[PDB]
Amino acid sequence: MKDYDELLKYYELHETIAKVKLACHILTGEMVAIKIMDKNTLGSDLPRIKTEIEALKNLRHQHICQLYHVLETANKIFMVLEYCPGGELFDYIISQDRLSEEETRVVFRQIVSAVAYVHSQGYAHRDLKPENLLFDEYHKLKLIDCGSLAYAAPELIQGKSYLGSEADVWSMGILLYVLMCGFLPFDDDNVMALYKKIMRGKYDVPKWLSPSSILLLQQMLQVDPKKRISMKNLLNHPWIMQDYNYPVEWQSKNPFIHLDDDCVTELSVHHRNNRQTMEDLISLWQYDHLTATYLLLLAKKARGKPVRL
């Protein structure tokens, strides 16, 4: 099939993980996750996923899975994203039963950092849940992307026009609960009973939760989105500040503007161009093979692997 022609110039496909395949970037040897979307099946949804790809092009952060490459053919769209070998967050919560308040704080501060940055760029995620949070090789969290009902804010369930920011805060409250308890605050075999439980907003408070844990949950989990704690307050909340003594770092460390000389130098030689020219081209950020190759060289560098293509 011709849809794979251009893609197989850049990557070797491996196992299945939209369909998602593990792949190897030929030039760097770096592993990636490739999301394969078929335009025909998407149909009426196509213009909406196009908007979402453009949102991800505007997100570069230490706690968001990097988009490396976007390729479009007659029938498909390929998104080359970061491979996260540590797995998804709920699998991790299952391995430890539940996290201590301490290890919840480590994890939760990363989640807050990513969400705050998403809101800073003018988006809301709107689908926060453990499945959308993965561990990288450094055991650091990365955010990606009836089934999501358990994490849905009361207003989101009702169909009332929502503010994404307030809905995200509620979802984080649910995540905070799951991290510290190892089960959901609102759960039922019956969908109708789950709807009523979420809109009621009453949940068991286990005996092992500190009063500061319990207060933060009450502030995040408010059925009225107007009474819900704002993101700014969350950044420097006493529970959050504990043991760190500094607010959540939400600002991106991963810049669009700054470049790495070593990676630029290696691409210059390979392209047979100068430093100024190679810098001009890379800073275009077209999310083509160049973008992919540059960002994967930067990852290869961070692991301490050789930079030679």
Does the annotation mark 127 as catalytic?
yes
Q: Which is nearer to ligand F7D, 56 or 153 (CB)?
A: 56
Among 144, 150, 248, 296, binds ligand F7D (CB under 6 A): 144
Does 166 contact ligand F7D by CB under 6 A? no
Q: Is 19 annotated as a binding residue?
A: yes
Give Dmax (Cα) for the chain. 65
Q: Closest separation between CB of residue 155 and ligand F7D, Å?
A: 26
Total number of residues that touch ligand F7D (CB under 6 A): 15
Q: Closest separation between CB of residue 46 and ligand F7D, Å?
A: 18
Q: Which is nearer to ligand F7D, 70 or 278 (CB)?
A: 70
Chain positions 99 to 138 lying near ligand F7D, rule: CB under 6 A, are 134
Give Cβ neighbours of residue 237 (< 8 Å, ≥ 6 apart). 216, 219, 229
Among 11, 68, 78, 83, binds ligand F7D (CB under 6 A): 83
C-alpha span between 190 and 34 (Å, rounded): 36
Q: Closest separation between CB of residue 287 and ligand F7D, Å?
A: 13
Chain positions 9 to 68 lying near ligand F7D, rule: CB under 6 A, are 17, 20, 33, 35, 65
Q: Closest separation between CB of residue 268 and ligand F7D, Å?
A: 29
C-alpha span between 46 and 41 (Å, rounded): 9
Binding span for ligand F7D by CB under 6 A among 85-93, 179-187, 243-251, 283-291: 85-93
C-alpha span between 29 and 303 (Å, rounded): 13
Size (the chain), residues: 309
Does 70 contact ligand F7D by CB under 6 A? no
Q: Closest separation between CB of residue 104 and ligand F7D, Å?
A: 21
- Which residue in the block uniquely carries the two structure tokens 């275009």? 284
C-alpha span between 23 and 31 (Å, rounded): 6
**Of the candidates 145, 149, 150, the residue with the CA atom closest to the CA atom of residue 123:** 145
Q: Which is nearer to ligand F7D, 118 or 134 (CB)?
A: 134
Give Cβ neighbours of residue 169 (< 8 Å, ≥ 6 apart). 220, 228, 229, 230, 231, 234
Q: Which of 127, 145, 188, 260 is catalytic?
A: 127
Give Cβ neighbours of residue 100 (< 8 Å, ≥ 6 apart). none
Among 59, 77, 81, 220, binds ligand F7D (CB under 6 A): 81
- Which pair of tokens denotes residue 218? 């009450």
Q: How far apart are the first and last CA of the chain?
A: 28
- Which pair of tokens denotes residue 149? 């009902």
Cβ neighbours, 10 Å, residue 15 = 8
Does 85 contact ligand F7D by CB under 6 A? yes
Give Cβ neighbours of residue 83 (< 8 Å, ≥ 6 apart). 22, 31, 32, 33
The catalytic residues are 127
Which residues would be at the binding site for ligand F7D (CB under 6 A)? 17, 20, 33, 35, 65, 81-85, 87-88, 134, 144-145
Which residue positions form the known binding site for ATP?
17-20, 35
